[PDB]
Symmetry: C2
Subunit: 126 residues, 2 copies
């Protein structure tokens, strides 16, 4: 049985699950890469030192992030964020860095970016 | 430090990591969904009962699968499969089911499919 996750459980997942899997499109083909994200002010913040990822997402800014907690084949939770790559300007990197780090529970030339949310969905199976 | 994974470690991962994250494209936007796969005869076999996934991949058969083993921010292994959705015909479902199940280590209307490999890459960080 697959049901919709409550907003509370979606929120717990996207506040507390550091690692997400980022999807982007190159030449009409999907690529997935694990990244660590911080949800702050309704967007997800991250960075990459991989110029190929940066370039890909500049040319096609339609991206997603999967967060999931998979216990078994029949016990799992998934949250999909669909949105847009928005690259952080040099002038705004210190803001991005503080948003990323400020009051995080866990312990920790990049190009910083955020993911603005166009659709957020969450489901679970018990 | 990010290096290329050996073929042996790539092989260990794609033989033994049941859960992968599937990427596909709808209307130029990426979607990611966790699925369980079996690598057999150079392709990855799976199935879905979700008609929306099936329909999406029929219209754009360019897909990928990420397998990963993430220990920390700096200790991880990733294998990306880029390939094509190839839907299994009714006549071939029993073959698909046996390939999926036959001599698997672990314990376990669908539409069966396989993912034929066009690029396989694997990297790790220590
Ligand atoms: Cl990252
Ligand atoms: Cl910002
Ligand atoms: Cl599955
Ligand atoms: Cl087949």
């Amino acid at each position: 049985l697959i049901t919709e996750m409550s907003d509370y459980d979606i929120r717990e997942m996207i506040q507390h699950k550091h690692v997400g899997r980022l999807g982007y499109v190159v030449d009409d083909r999907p690529i997935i890469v694990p990244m660590t994200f911080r949800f702050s002010g309704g967007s997800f913040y991250s960075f990459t030192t991989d110029g190929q990822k940066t370039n890909a997402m500049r040319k096609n800014d339609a991206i997603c992030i999967l967060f999931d907690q998979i216990e078994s084949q029949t016990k799992w939770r998934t949250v999909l964020v669909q949105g847009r790559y928005r690259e952080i300007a040099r002038e705004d990197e210190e803001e991005a860095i503080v948003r990323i780090m400020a009051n995080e529970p866990t312990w920790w030339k990049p190009v910083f970016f955020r993911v603005d949310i166009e659709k957020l969905s969450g489901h679970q199976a018990e």
